[PDB]
């Protein structure tokens, strides 16, 4: 999974 | 999956 | 932010 | 921030 | 799995 | 920040 903020 | 803020 | 795949 | 995959 | 700020 | 895979 990827979290980008 | 995925979280873009 | 931005995520591309 | 970003992510290119 | 990928985190980017 | 930056990601490019």
Do not use: A, I, K, R
Not at 1 to 5: D, E, H, I, P
């Amino acid at each position: 999974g990827n979290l980008v903020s």
